[PDB]
Amino acid sequence: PPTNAERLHEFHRAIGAATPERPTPPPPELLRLRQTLLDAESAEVRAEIDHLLARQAAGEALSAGDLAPLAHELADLLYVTYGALDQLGIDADAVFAEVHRANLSKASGPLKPEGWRPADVRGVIERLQHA
Amino acid sequence: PPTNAERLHEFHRAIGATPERPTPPPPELLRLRQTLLDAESAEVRAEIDHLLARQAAGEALSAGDLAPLAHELADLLYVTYGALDQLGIDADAVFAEVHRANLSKASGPRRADGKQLKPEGWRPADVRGVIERLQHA
Numbered sequence A: 001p002p003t004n005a006e007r008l009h010e011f012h013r014a015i016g017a018a019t020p021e022r023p024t025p026p027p028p029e030l031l032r033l034r035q036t037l038l039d040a041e042s043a044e045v046r047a048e049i050d051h052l053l054a055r056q057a058a059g060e061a062l063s064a065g066d067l068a069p070l071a072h073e074l075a076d077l078l079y080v081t082y083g084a085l086d087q088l089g090i091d092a093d094a095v096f097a098e099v100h101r102a103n104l105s106k107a108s109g110p111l112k113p114e115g116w117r118p119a120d121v122r123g124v125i126e127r128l129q130h131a
Numbered sequence B: 001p002p003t004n005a006e007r008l009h010e011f012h013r014a015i016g017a018t019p020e021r022p023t024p025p026p027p028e029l030l031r032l033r034q035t036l037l038d039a040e041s042a043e044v045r046a047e048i049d050h051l052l053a054r055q056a057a058g059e060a061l062s063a064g065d066l067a068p069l070a071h072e073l074a075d076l077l078y079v080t081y082g083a084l085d086q087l088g089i090d091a092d093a094v095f096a097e098v099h100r101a102n103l104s105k106a107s108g109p110r111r112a113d114g115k116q117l118k119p120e121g122w123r124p125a126d127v128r129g130v131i132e133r134l135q136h137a
């Protein structure tokens, strides 16, 4: 099964959207569009969360199915977040792996483990540039 | 091979934090996840602004100049998957449903800013169906 990052590549190729194979500095038009898409889904997640809190305040004992609008919007947020990486030509799974390494690694302590190394995303990008 | 949603499950087990099926959360957990989302959203916005500003100032960007934005986008992925995991909700199964509805947009037109729009007859994602099926298995 494809990862969610590979699904974004399939989406962008299917609509003729720019999706370079390697890290590519974007024109300002792409950056402003990605901001618009991120702002839309951030506001829609916030709305669904506010809703759920409003329902709990009225005593509601939510069920699993009540989470479906929120789950939806969280997935929309993933979709526009992966999408920005994909249009930058930046393999999202490679960047994620590095942020995951730094995060799982920091999780040994009680805070930083003695030999801890922060996420080196710049290094991931330079490794992506080559093939 | 492990997906990024499964990575969030491991991270939560590493920190002693998550349910195996869709589980309504207590309000304090909702407020916490919203705060993490808003924190990484702002850091992403800041990095988009910094790249737009350098471009407006006549700077020609390098691929390496994308490292801070790419970092913050991964950070936003991390706390977004983190919320789905803590809800007990399989992120990859919900993502596949949204993906199907977005692929079906391929014949639609584009907005003036580049945004892909919906073709006539487009049917939206059925996430509730996915959530219900994730309960019972």
Ligand SMILES: O=c1ccn([C@H]2C[C@H](O)[C@@H](COP(=O)(O)NP(=O)(O)OP(=O)(O)O)O2)c(=O)[nH]1
Binding pocket: A037, A040, A075, A076, A077, A079, A080, A083, B098, B102, B114, B115, B116, B117, B118, B124, B125
């Ligand atoms: O250019 C685009 C346009 C949309 N999308 C994705 C993001 C999100 O998952 C969804 C946003 O499209 P719309 O704003 O048109 N609304 P949506 O499809 O989410 O409709 P609904 O709110 O009813 O589910 O499609 C992109 O990724 N790139």
Ligand SMILES: [Mn+2]
Binding pocket: A040, A041, A044, A072, A073, A076
């Ligand atoms: Mn949405």
Ligand SMILES: [Mn+2]
Binding pocket: A072, A076
């Ligand atoms: Mn949607």
Ligand SMILES: [Mn+2]
Binding pocket: B040, B043, B071, B072, B075
């Ligand atoms: Mn961050």
